[PDB]
Amino acid sequence: HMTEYKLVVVGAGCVGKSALTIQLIQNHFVDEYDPTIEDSYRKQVVIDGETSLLDILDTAGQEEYSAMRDQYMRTGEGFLLVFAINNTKSFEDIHHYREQIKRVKDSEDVPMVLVGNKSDLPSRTVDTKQAQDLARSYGIPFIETSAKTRQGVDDAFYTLVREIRKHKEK
Numbered sequence: 001h002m003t004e005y006k007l008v009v010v011g012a013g014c015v016g017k018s019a020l021t022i023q024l025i026q027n028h029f030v031d032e033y034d035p036t037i038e039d040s041y042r043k044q045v046v047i048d049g050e051t052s053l054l055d056i057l058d059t060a061g062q063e064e065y066s067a068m069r070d071q072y073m074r075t076g077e078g079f080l081l082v083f084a085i086n087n088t089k090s091f092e093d094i095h096h097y098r099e100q101i102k103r104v105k106d107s108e109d110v111p112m113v114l115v116g117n118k119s120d121l122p123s124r125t126v127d128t129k130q131a132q133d134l135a136r137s138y139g140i141p142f143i144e145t146s147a148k149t150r151q152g153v154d155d156a157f158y159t160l161v162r163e164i165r166k167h168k169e170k
């Protein structure tokens with residue numbers, strides 16, 4: 001009567017992986033480094049009537065190559081690929097994170113969602129159509145988020161859960 005989902009958040013430094021996680025789990029945000037990430041790893045929530053235990057693994061603080069990152073990529077059932085819409089380099093890095101996950105899984109069909117975070121900020125440098133084209137080429141959804149206003153936060157994590165369900169049922 002509960003179903004666990006193991007969700008992994010990946011992306012360049014400072015894109016908001018940890019803020020997205022804390023907003024989902026604690027309904028909390030601060031515009032600074034948030035030490036409550038240490039306390040923010042499981043949320044129990046009902047999604048489409050299913051009582052779901054969302055275990056969120058946040059790669060913040062890991063080196064770009066580490067044994068713990070590999071453990072996260074091996075255990076994760078779905079991945080959020082996060083970039084920030086005001087940081088072009090973080091968008092350019094998405095290719096690397098996608099390839100790294102695929103190479104661990106030996107699969108071309110891993111549940112993922114592309115997330116463009118910090119959508120509350122003006123002066124974006126990554127346009128939406130760029131991200132839509134990239135997500136289309138990967139076969140995965142794109143969702144714009146803000147960990148500050150909570151724009152898109154439930155949409156991003158719940159969409160990833162629904163992609164996992166589709167994957168499990170064929």
Ligand SMILES: *CCC(=O)NCCNC(=O)O[C@H]1[C@@H](O)[C@H](n2cnc3c(=O)[nH]c(N)nc32)O[C@@H]1COP(=O)(O)OP(=O)(O)O
Nearest residue numbers: 013014015016017018019030031032033060118146147148
């Ligand atoms: C990261 C460098 C930096 O910003 N340094 C200044 C101190 N402030 C922060 O670190 O702020 C963090 C978040 O509050 C902020 N953030 C995250 N998501 C945001 C959003 O949707 N809208 C706005 N306005 N700010 C947002 O970004 C900083 C980094 O977030 P993080 O969550 O700690 O980043 P990673 O885990 O991805 O490293």
